[PDB]
């Protein structure tokens, strides 16, 4: 559970930790799957793909203070869910905050 979240975690990349019919995960995905990424640099992991489910939840809650999918981390930074992101994409916070980390063609 550690090993595995913590290597998918990295400075100036995208990550959601999602499941399998998540309304608000799909929302989320059809949020970041429309900006211009550069390749390998935005990644959906789904967390009903390993045996140990309900431990990367648990390491989550330690992590970022709640367990819930989707999990948004843009680096090393959760910055929430599905209505957090769409707060920045509504302020237009998003795509400056994407460019700084150089994870846009």
Sequence with gaps: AQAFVNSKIQ???VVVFIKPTCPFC????EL??????KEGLLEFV???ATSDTNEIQDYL???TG?????????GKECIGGCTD????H????????????GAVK
Excluded: N, Y
Excluded at 26 to 29: E, I, Y
């Design 85 to 88: 992101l769409e707060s920045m």
């Design 61 to 63: 809650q330690q992590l």
């Design 90 to 101: 509504k302020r237009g916070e998003l795509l400056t905050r994407l460019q700084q980390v």
């Design 46 to 48: 789904d967390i009903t």
């Design 32 to 37: 970041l799957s429309q900006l211009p990424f």
């Design 66 to 74: 709640a367990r819930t999918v989707p999990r948004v981390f843009i």
């Design 11 to 13: 400075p100036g990349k």
């Design 26 to 29: 799909r929302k989320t995905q």
